[PDB]
Structures are given as structure tokens and as C-alpha cells.
Subunit: 377 residues, 4 copies
């Protein structure tokens, strides 16, 4: 069978919004680790609207945070369709509803109730070194490489907006090759399409995709519209939380529907999904399964989860029901437990808002620190 | 194992946005079936912002469409925190990028290119009469029931914002029961929690959930914060395309990340996901599989898909690669082919923007009209 | 001849905007008296947009200030068309341009430059005890009376939005009577027009206007479209700085065009118009003229005014050249000096933003503490 | 004595707002001459918000009108701080309240009610050929000149945002000279202050201001903070109706407070101020006074003005009681009549939204076609 996963650069309008949302979250947490933040960002031709519900003792400069974020992304001139230095920054930030907060923050700190209801999924598969699905990891690297080539001036005619897509060929449940690649990138008007296609293939795609998976029958589509000068917020509206699949496992695993960026750890949409990646990775790391997918769910203002489910796809190396009640022993999945487990009350979330929340070494939910102590029990 | 799906009422802030987006799409398509529409809606305390990229010959009243939509949902008074008749309606609507239209609308009509790149999933499972996963269909019915009991005045203290969550117990791959239920609903200040919990238990949950699946160990969580007076856009920002899982299969199937509402059929994020539901359902209806999950993908401005994948979870009733072989013969999955297959150039999409896009008889992608022809060529 | 002036209530949309701008200003100055503030507010159905240029070390809660200000005004329910508790509050506040600031905050505070170029008028007349023109005085009193009988419950069907207008008859420079009165007020649907008109007459108009100026020839126009249920920002957009004649002299005197509200005192549009009122009032209180109009002008970044003019309409008691010299001697009109002269670096401005900036004698620019000095020096 | 007036260029943010509001009005009136339009515009860094109350059968492209208007003004690049092609255009346009409209559009068109209450002034003076005060005339000419030499490429480092101010010396009611001139203009970073100041002197100030009014005593203030690179909406919020003295008589005459731009002629704030200029100009052109100030006032939903006043500052050549009678005999100041008198139901307003509503004699309220009639009836 064929399988396909996509990713987007830091300049894609939805990722701009995600990044602004987590930039504001970060600034707040630097001052107020216990702040309640639900930051939703809307980006369109000429304007950033930052809104949502925040309850904090912190004082942050929404305008300067936003301009700085768009500046680092690279939109700094009207020729690119968007300029960090001259766009509108609007705030529509209110307070968190008192009807919600009475369910989260309560008497005993360890009794903290879930921020909301909802379902979250985690996933891990041994087919890569970082225990991630291959299609989404190489999609991320393709767009991450585009931004690095753009920023270090190797291809100065590049623009921030870009998307990648890769369609892998599988057999025996293992990678055979790559049947199709797509790399669409915004560009200045100076460069013709033929020069751009060759530069993308040589400088973007070949350094990232192992040539074994590439054949003469491997199909390539580079700016297949034939022109990508208009881009960023000018050609497409950007919204926080509209890339939740490229944020996670590229469609290789199911999703509960919860967005990540702009949300402080009290939101189980984020903190549970990180903890679900945490256990599913460790479970694989201990060789107890080849592939593992966890589903947890919560009720509003209720500490204990309402559902836990371990799925091994017929690859378990110990009975599945032993695997389930071992998750329950070595991981605390109540809201207060998620935050303690992963050391989450820190400004570490802007770095997550582009190129995937999962599969990066240093994230606390990526550490394989309980791998050994899984076997022993 | 236990599996959990959720859904939200038409009054949930994200669904308000989805509904406004598709309400605008509908008005446009009624005048201009060929319009290019990408309508993104942002709703917060006191305001609706309608934005996006539209290229159309149609003239529509964004303000009145929006107020009328919020009216029908039920926010018609400041006591509820939001009033269709006095909120701000802002428009930030631009034109579609010329660099994209040159890849969609090109030369031959049947050589039309995909609206974007992306991946889309479809799904069907025989475990319900409408071939949908059970958790998401009963989730949808719980909030759909909440809106109907609110609107016909049986529980007049109900307010439009509501959510449901059901935890099903599976084993043998079959439904054992329901281990947990959640029904959070916005309410007037008149009624206390005990009275509300009883009324929700009696008028909401019991008429909808088969009593067999309820035991006495079945947990019930009703307004578990203890108060749900503040609600709608006042308590929670609402955005178009932020309920893509409750829009589809409640997490039972994978998702490609594409939102549906506010998008005209030239966006493969919508029309392909509808066509993948179409083929995955008809495949099950022909008895060729018990459960079937389809993945297709496209490259922007390219007619033919870049990937097709039929996954039957080991429940196939014919060889797997003959099942992929037949999808490619009796279904045209190029952009123009999707639209012809399902007759999508019609104002039918507002009805989809709440209570699921899948599992409702009348949608063109729910017809079981190729079921027999798939068993023939099998 | 006939002369007409108008005023508007604290609930008129433009005055809502002025009051929010100056509420924000006051909140900042309480923490940072030397803040640079140019706060512009836009109010329309369902939303308040607070924008402008602010450089300050203060932190103020724009949302809470706005809601509290709109609450005090009385818009607290969707039936009124606007609700302080559920409207959107958006911010678009930037920083003051450093290109402007280097001209204002120079190294030497004594050389503080004018915050902009421009011209400003001050006026006084011994026609009333507070040395204001009579038409604007009584126009303010009518809308202040409307607000009082609304707020104290006398006429609870009144809504916050209202306007007044009075046409006076003059003969040989003296008021002889009132020729026409207009009073428009928003109201609930519960009251019919004829009953409203009688109540406005008895409770608003007759207690405020002197009876000896009202005759059988006086025309009274009360809600003369026949209906005023829709009002506030729903019926009419409100913007800061769009009531500058109501704010000053009601058309009796000239105006240089600069708005007041939302501006810190380094904006000479505000501080130099207060100073010009101060010198005009003190000239008339000193008995040196019956009527006095002062023009002053500035260049941005320059301390010394570009012009000063004293106009007394033939009423002067000492030569006009003497009066102009007395103004130079007794008043500092450089920005540093006038801010110190009037003690302007305090949170005193929200109070000015409805019912007129002049004629209320606890304002520092209304003190006549230089009148005896001027009478002596002349 | 000294008297001062100011003006602003088409690129000043308040004037950007006035021009967008009147461009919207014109686009609507081209399709629907009887539309009810109250279009209010707010411009700040990166965004234009077009709002207000409009009832019309026209459809106009608000975005395209806004972008085209800002392009014509000259903000077309982020280096300038504002870009017509990449700024946000938001709409918050509602409908006119039917409670207002039932008072305006009554069954009998002759009984058309005033769009609001309010007071309006008109003014004329034989100080200049167009019968306007000299200070606002020359202040307008300075910023018009700034825009001209920016636009024709003479001084290409000029940017659109600019302001002027002139202080005239009067002696016995005549201009004797100019005491001070202010000219502030946004500019690119490529030019230094002293070079800019000399270029502004030579190319903007000296070709416009009479040389006999400029002496060694005249003070010249050119970009007196020392830098004006940040400008336009980035430096200063723009709002419709925040230049109403620049729009009219530069402070020489009184004002009733109503803004002009974005309003259709049923708003007497605009149409009755145009009418008041028309009757004042015709009185002075008829030779019946040297300067003349008219006040008119209305009640909302009422056709007959609540007051009319004729002030001639002692310069009248016939009794002031007779002048007021001539005004009532020769001018119709009811809303129906004044809209007919000045033929106001046409897309003519965008042109008014910068460089002043008065003094430009192709406008219909600038015609002196009643002066000879007034001259006859007075004797
Ligand atoms: C703009 S498209 C979606 C279609 C759009 N909403 C419309 O109005 O039709 C979404 C993404 O595709 C990318 N994109 C935009 N223009 C493109 C072009 N000419 N070629 C390839 N990719 C493009 C951008 O990263 C953009 O965010
Ligand atoms: C708690 S959530 C998201 C968290 C929120 N953004 C915050 O500020 O923390 C809000 C959503 O859940 C529902 N909700 C809001 N308040 C609720 C309450 N007291 N009890 C149960 N559900 C509530 C509403 O449908 C609303 O859309
Ligand atoms: C909150 S900060 C002051 C913090 C700063 N570190 C200090 O104390 O000097 C004030 C700046 O942020 C901007 N600002 C935006 N919103 C503001 C708000 N509600 N209150 C105060 N300043 C605001 C203004 O441009 C203002 O100059
Ligand atoms: C609404 S009117 C201005 C014209 C209006 N914007 C339109 O669309 O025609 C301006 C002010 O007049 C007052 N007003 C509103 N409705 C009124 C009514 N029905 N009768 C009398 N005055 C009214 C309110 O104070 C309002 O702010
Ligand atoms: C009614 S018109 C469309 C004309 C239509 N044929 C009719 O007669 O009803 C559009 C209405 O929506 C509002 N509107 C919003 N945006 C508009 C726009 N760009 N152009 C004209 N009207 C607009 C106005 O209140 C206007 O009355
Ligand atoms: C920006 S200033 C007014 C006060 C300003 N809002 C503040 O924050 O202090 C008003 C007008 O003066 C002009 N202006 C802006 N910057 C200027 C500068 N550096 N020098 C001279 N004039 C300037 C522009 O026409 C601007 O619209
Ligand atoms: K208005
Ligand atoms: K006078
Ligand atoms: K300003
Ligand atoms: K005069
Ligand atoms: Mg998107
Ligand atoms: Mg969610
Ligand atoms: Mg949401
Ligand atoms: Mg998508
Ligand atoms: Mg107004
Ligand atoms: Mg000013
Ligand atoms: Mg201004
Ligand atoms: Mg007015």
C-alpha cells in the first residue's frame, strides 16, 4: 500500500498563528508558571488578531511578541505580502470563565480537574530511530530544510511559505521507497520555474530524502501550479490549531481533535497528548510492542481519566491486558500528574509550534527514561 | 478495551463558526455554483469575524446571514452571553490568490487540478445501521437531542452551548456496553444542579442510549464543574475547522487534518473526504469488508491523486489488492470527478456544519447506490 | 437674531468613545503621570475598538476599564442595543513614534516641544456666572437632566442615548427668550410617543429652562421621527473626537479643530485649549472685557507658541495691545509652563469627557486666581 | 494681530480616512443616488476599518475601493509604513436605523426630514478671489504643493503624510505679511534634515507663498522634531471627521461640529453646511457685505430649519433684518429643497475629502449664480 503525510514550514499561515499563540504562552509562563492561557490567533492579509482567554499575573507585550515572532519567521517586507513591522496587531483577550476555573483549580492541588472533556491519542512505531512514523518525520525535515536554506542565504529568493508532501510505498509493514514527493515553496519573482525546480531538488530534497527510497519512477511535483509568488497570510487565512495532524503523527495515528498551541498545561488537549506520546514511546522503547497507540479521555473538572486504551496492532510482546494495567501503575494520568511527570510549567512551547510536537530529543515527553523500568515489571 | 468519542451542540463556539462559514458558502452557491469560497470564521465575546478568500459573481449579505445563523442557534439575548441581534459582524473577505486559481480552473474542465495538497481519510464499519462507528453516532445524537429538547421548550432553561462524551466498552470487536457518559450543557440560573442532572438524565440521555448498554456501574458526569451558566463565545473562543474529529468519525478513523466548513467543493480537503466516505461505505455495503478505511492524497493543481490506499483491518472478503484495483475503476477521484460523482455544486453544506458530516441518509456521499455493482465486479 | 447650540448625553456613541478614551488615559496617568497617550476609540454594534499610540510604564486593564465605563453609562442589556458585559473589547494600541517624541521630550524639560502643530481657541463671556455662553450651558443641562432622571429611576424607560438643542433669541446682545427646543432620547418599547413627550416636557425640559424664556411661541421637538428605540452604537457609530463643539462652546466661539479626549497634556490640542480658556476667563473675570476669544498656535517640537491673539469684540476696557502684553506677562503658554500652570499631570480627565470641558469650576482651567492680578497690572 | 490656520495633505491619516469614506459614498451614489450612507473609517498601522450605517441597493467592493484610494494617495510599500496592496481591509457596515429613516424619508418627498439635529455654519469674505479666508487658502496650497512635487517626481523622497500651518499678520483687517510657516513632511531615510529643509523651502514654500509677505522676520519651521520618517497610520491613528476645521475655513469662522465625509446629502451636517457656504458666498458676491457668516440648525425628522442667522460683522450694505429676509426668499434650506438647489445626488464627494470643501469653484455650492438676483432684490 501507499501512505501519505504532509508538513508545512514555519511561514505557512496556520503555523504563523500556532507560533504566535505559543510565543504568547511562553512569555506568560516565564513570569507566571501557573497562568491559565487559551490563546487563539487569526492571521490574514495585513493583520494579526490575538484572542482567547487568559488569567495571569504576568504582563506581556502582545504587539512586540507578535512582531518579533513574524520577524523571526521572515515576513519583513510588503514584497513578500506581509511585514512584521507594519502589520496590524489586534488583541481580543478576555478572562477565563469562572464557571470553568472552579473545576480546574480546587482545594487539593493533586485533585486538579481536567481542563475540559475530550479524547487524546499517542503513538510510537519502531520504524525510525526516534520511534516516529517515517512519512511525517521526512515531511517535517523537508520543510525544516527549506527554512534553513532560506535563512542561511543559500537560496535567497525563497520566501517563508512552503509545504511538503511525501507518499511512501510500504510492504511487509516496512518501507520500500518513496513513490511521490511534493515540495511547494513561495518565491520572489526573480527566479524562473525551471531554475527553481532544479534548486529545490538539489538543495532541498536530495539532502533530506535517502536516495535508496528514490527511483527513476519516483514522482516529483514542484510548484505544480506553476507560480508561488503570492503567499503567507495574503493568499491564505491562518488560524491556531488548523494543523493538528502535521502537529502529531501525519495521519499514521488517530486524533482526538484537540489543538495544542496557545494552551497552558492545564488543558488536557495538550498535556495528555504529550503524556500519551510519552507512554507509547516508552512502551516501544522497552520492546513490549513494535507499534503502540494510546487513547485517553477526560471529563470536565474531573481528575481521573474516563478512558484508557492501549492498542498494539497485533505486535504486543506481552499480554495486552497486562500492558494496559501497567500503564495504570507507572504513569499518573490525572491532570496534576501529567504536569509533574513531564515538568511542563516552563516556557518551552514556542519551539513546539512548528515542525512537529513529537520526535525531538529534548522535549520532556520524548525522553526514554522509563524504558528499562518497563521490562522489569 | 474502552473507546471514547465526543460531539458538541450547534451552540458550541467552534460549531457556531463552522455553521456561519457554511451558511455563507450556501448563500453564495445558491447564486453562483462555480464560486471559489474559503470562509474562515472567528467568534468571541460580542463579535463574529468572517474572513477568507472568495471569488464569486454572487452578492450576499454577510451581516444578515450571520445574525440569522446565530439566531437559529438560539443566542438571542445578553443573558445567554451572546445576542444575534446586537453582536458585531466584521468582514475580512479577500479575493482568491491568482497563483492558485491558475492551477484549479485550467484549460479542460475535466483536467481541473486539486485545490491544494493534502491527505484525506474515509471510513465505514458495519457495527451500525448507517455504517458509522457507534461512539460518534451516539455522541452526535446526545447533543442533537439536547438542542431539540431546548428548542421545543421541554427544558426551557437550557442554553445552546453543550457537549457530549460516551465511553464504549468493546470486546470481540463488538459493543459490550457504555462505561461512561458525559453531558455538559449551558443553563439558565433558575435551576439548581440536582434538578438539572435529573432532567438531563431523564430527557436527554435515556431516550437516546439503548438501556442494555447502561449498567449500574456506568459512570455519569453531568456539568461536573458544578455550574455551566457562562457559555458560548463568552467563555470560549470559536474558530472554523476546530472540530474536524467530531465532524468525521470521533477518532475511530484517522484524519488528514483538513477542515470542511466554509470550503467550496473544489477544495479536496472536503470533496475528497466526502468521496472517501462514499467509497468506504459502498465497499462495506457490498459486504466486501466489515470495516474499511480509505486514504487518498493530492498535489496542488494536479488532477490525478498522488496516493490511494484501501485498508480493511484483516476483515476483507476478497483479496486486498483486487479491492484497491476496483476502487480505481468505478470511482473518478480527480477533482472534477469528485464533484460529478456526488453532485456537489448545490447549497447543501450548512446542514453538514453540526452533528457530523457522515451518517445522514440524504447526503449524496451517503447513498449506497454502487453497493451491488461492487459485488458484481468482485 | 437666533442662535442655536446642542449637547449630547453620556450615552451618545461619540461620548461613549470620548469617555472610554479618557478613562484609559486616567488609569494610565494614575500610575505614570508623564505617560504619552493618544487613545482613539471606535464603538459600533457589539464592539469597542480601543486604539492609538501609547508609551507608558503603566499597565492598565483596557477590557475592564471599557466595560466599567460602559456600565456606568448604563448600557447593560441587549434590549438597550448594547451591553457592557457582553460586547467585544478589541485593542489596537501601538507605541508613540520616536520621531515625534524626540521633539516633545527634549533633554531640557523647560524646552518641551508642543506635541503637534495646530491652533486652539479659548473663550469667555460674562453672559453667565461661570463665564460661559448661555446656549451651550443650557444644552448641557438638558442632557445632564435626562441622564439624572434615567439613573435615579424617575423615568426608568429612558435609555442612555440622548441629544438636546436650544435656539435662543437675542436682542441687543441679551437673551430675550428661547425660540425652539429639541430633545431626543432613546427609550424602551414600553412607552408610547405622546406619553414620552409629556414626561420629557415635565421632567427634563421645564425644570431646566427658565420659564420666562418659554412662551406660546416656543417650539418643542421631542423624538420628532416618532420613534427612538434603536440607539446607542447600534443606531450610530461612535468615535473619539467627534463632539469637539459640544465639548467647548457650542458654536458661540471659534475652534481650531483638535479633539480633547484620550490625549495626555503634552498634546497642546487639549492642554493649550484649556490654557486659552483659563486666560480668556481670567480676562473677563478681571473685568478687562465682556467677551474674550484667544487664539494660540504651535509647531510640533517647538516650545514657544507660533502665535497668540486676543479678540474682545469691541468690549475691551484697555487697549488690545495692552491685553496681549498682559497675556504674555501673566501666563506661560509654552508646553512646560502651561502644564505646570494648570497642574495637568493628574488623572482628572474622565470627568471632562461628557457635559462639556468648560464651565465646571473645580477644573483647574476654570479658576479665576489671576483676575485680581490682571486688574491690578492694567 | 496674528491669525493662524493649518492644513494637511491627502496622506495625513485623518484625510486618508475621509477619502476612503467619501470614495465608498461616491461608489454607492453612482449606482443608487438616494442611498443612505454614514460611512466611518478608522486607519491604524496595517489596517483599514470601514464601518457605519448604509442602506442602499448598490453593491460596491469595499476592499477594492479602499486599496485603490490608498494607492492613489501613495502608500504602496512597507518602507513608507503603510501598503495599499497588503494592508487589511475590514468591514463593520450595518444598516440605517428604521427609527431614523421614518423621520427622513416621509411619504411626501417635499417634507423630507433633516437627517439629524444640529447646527451648521457657512462663511464668505472678499479677502480672496474665491471669497475664502486667506490663511486656510494658503495652508491648503502648501500641502497641495507637497503632494504635487512628491507625485511628479521632483522630490521623490517625500512621503504622503504632511501638514502645513501659516501665521498671518493683520493690520486694520488687511494682510500685511506672514509671521511664521510650519511645513512638516514625512520622508525617506535617504535624506538628511538640512537638505530636506532647503528643498522644502525652495520647492514647496517659496513657490506658494507671496514673496512680499515673507521677510527676514518670518520664522520657518520645517520638520522641527528633526526627523519625520515614521508617518502615516503607523505614526498616528486616522479617523473620519477629525479634520473639520481644515475642511472648512481654517478657524476663521465658527463651526457647528458636524463632519462631512462619508455622509450622503440627507445628513444636514454636510448638505446644510454646503448650502450655508452657498448663501454666504452669494451674499458677499452680490456686494451686500464684505464678510458674512450664516448659522442654520435643524431638528431630526423635521423639514423646516429650527433657526437661521445672518452675521455680517458690521460690513453689511443693507439692514441685517433685510438680509435675513433675502435669505428666506432666495434659498430653500429645507432638506428636500437644498438637495435640489445644489444638485447633490451625484458621486461628487471624493474630490472634496482633501484640500478643503470650499474655495474650489466647480463645486455646486461655490457657484455665485444668485448674486445678481440678491443685488436686485436689495434695491
Ligand atoms: C492557499 S492554499 C488553500 C486554497 C485557498 N484557501 C483558496 O482560496 O483557494 C493553502 C496553502 O497552500 C500554499 N500555497 C499558496 N499558494 C500556493 C501556490 N501558488 N502554489 C503552491 N502552494 C501554494 C500555501 O502554503 C497556503 O497556505
Ligand atoms: C473548558 S472549554 C476550553 C477551555 C477554555 N478555553 C478556557 O478558558 O480554559 C470551553 C468549552 O467547553 C464548554 N464549557 C464551557 N464552560 C463549561 C462549563 N462550566 N462546564 C462544562 N462545559 C463548559 C463549552 O462548550 C466551551 O465551548
Ligand atoms: C504594559 S507596558 C509597561 C511595561 C514596561 N516593561 C514598563 O514598565 O516600562 C506599557 C506599554 O505597552 C503598550 N500597551 C499595550 N496595551 C497596553 C495596556 N492595556 N496598558 C498599558 N500599556 C499597553 C503600550 O504601547 C505601553 O507603552
Ligand atoms: C443616528 S444619528 C446620525 C445619522 C445616522 N448615523 C444614520 O445612519 O443616518 C446620530 C445621533 O442621533 C441620535 N439618534 C439616533 N436615533 C435617533 C432617533 N430615532 N431619533 C432622534 N435621534 C436619534 C443618536 O444620539 C445618534 O447617535
Ligand atoms: C442591500 S445591498 C445589496 C443590494 C440589493 N440588490 C438590494 O437592493 O437589497 C447591501 C446591503 O448590505 C450593507 N453592505 C455591506 N457591505 C456593503 C457593500 N460593499 N456595498 C453595499 N452595501 C453593503 C449595506 O447595509 C447594504 O444596504
Ligand atoms: C502623529 S501626530 C499627533 C500626536 C501623536 N498621535 C502622538 O502619538 O503623540 C499628528 C500628525 O502630525 C504628523 N506627524 C507625524 N510625525 C511627525 C513628525 N515626526 N514630525 C512632524 N509631524 C509629524 C502627521 O501628519 C500626524 O498624522
Ligand atoms: K455617526
Ligand atoms: K461673540
Ligand atoms: K491622533
Ligand atoms: K471674521
Ligand atoms: Mg489552513
Ligand atoms: Mg479541542
Ligand atoms: Mg475549540
Ligand atoms: Mg487543511
Ligand atoms: Mg457623530
Ligand atoms: Mg490635532
Ligand atoms: Mg487627528
Ligand atoms: Mg453630527
Amino acid at each position: 500500500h501507499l501512505f501519505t503525510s504532509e508538513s508545512v514550514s514555519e511561514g505557512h499561515p496556520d503555523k504563523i498563528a500556532d507560533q504566535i499563540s505559543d510565543a504568547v504562552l511562553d512569555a506568560i509562563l516565564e513570569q507566571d508558571p501557573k497562568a491559565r492561557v487559551a490563546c487563539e490567533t487569526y492571521v490574514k492579509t495585513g493583520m494579526v488578531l490575538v484572542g482567547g482567554e487568559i488569567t495571569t499575573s504576568a504582563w506581556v507585550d502582545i504587539e512586540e511578541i507578535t512582531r518579533n515572532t513574524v520577524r523571526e519567521i521572515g515576513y519583513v517586507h510588503s514584497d513578500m505580502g506581509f511585514d512584521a513591522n507594519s502589520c496590524a496587531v489586534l488583541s481580543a483577550i478576555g478572562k477565563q470563565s469562572p464557571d470553568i476555573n472552579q473545576g480546574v483549580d480546587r482545594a487539593d492541588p493533586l485533585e486538579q480537574g481536567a481542563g475540559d472533556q475530550g479524547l487524546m491519542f499517542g503513538y510510537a512505531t519502531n520504524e525510525t530511530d526516534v520511534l516516529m512514523p517515517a512519512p511525517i518525520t521526512y515531511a517535517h525535515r523537508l520543510v525544516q530544510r527549506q527554512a534553513e536554506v532560506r535563512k542561511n542565504g543559500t537560496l535567497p529568493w525563497l520566501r517563508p511559505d512552503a509545504k511538503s508532501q511525501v507518499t511512501f510505498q510500504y510492504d511487509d509493514g516496512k518501507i520500500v521507497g518513496i513513490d511521490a514527493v511534493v515540495l511547494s515553496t513561495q518565491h520572489s519573482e526573480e527566479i524562473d520555474q525551471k531554475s527553481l525546480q532544479e534548486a529545490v531538488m538539489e538543495e532541498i530534497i536530495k539532502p533530506i530524502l535517502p536516495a535508496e527510497w528514490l527511483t527513476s519512477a519516483t514522482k516529483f511535483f514542484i510548484n505544480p501550479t506553476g507560480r508561488f509568488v503570492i503567499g503567507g497570510p495574503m493568499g491564505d487565512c491562518g488560524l491556531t490549531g488548523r494543523k493538528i495532524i502535521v502537529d502529531t503523527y501525519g495521519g499514521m495515528a488517530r486524533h482526538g481533535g484537540g489543538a495544542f498551541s496557545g494552551k497552558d498545561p492545564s488543558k488536557v488537549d495538550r498535556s495528555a497528548a504529550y503524556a500519551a506520546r510519552y507512554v507509547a514511546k516508552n512502551i516501544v522503547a522497552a520492546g513490549l510492542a513494535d507499534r503502540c497507540e494510546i487513547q485517553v479521555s477526560y471529563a470536565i473538572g474531573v481528575a481521573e481519566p474516563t478512558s484508557i486504551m492501549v492498542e498494539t496492532f497485533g505486535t504486543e510482546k506481552v499480554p495486552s491486558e497486562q500492558l494496559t494495567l501497567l500503564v495504570r501503575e507507572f504513569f499518573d494520568l490525572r491532570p496534576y500528574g501529567l504536569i509533574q511527570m513531564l515538568d511542563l510549567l516552563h516556557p518551552i512551547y514556542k519551539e513546539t509550534a512548528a515542525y512537529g510536537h513529537f520526535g525531538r530529543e529534548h522535549f520532556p515527553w520524548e525522553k526514554t527514561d522509563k524504558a528499562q523500568l518497563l521490562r522489569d515489571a
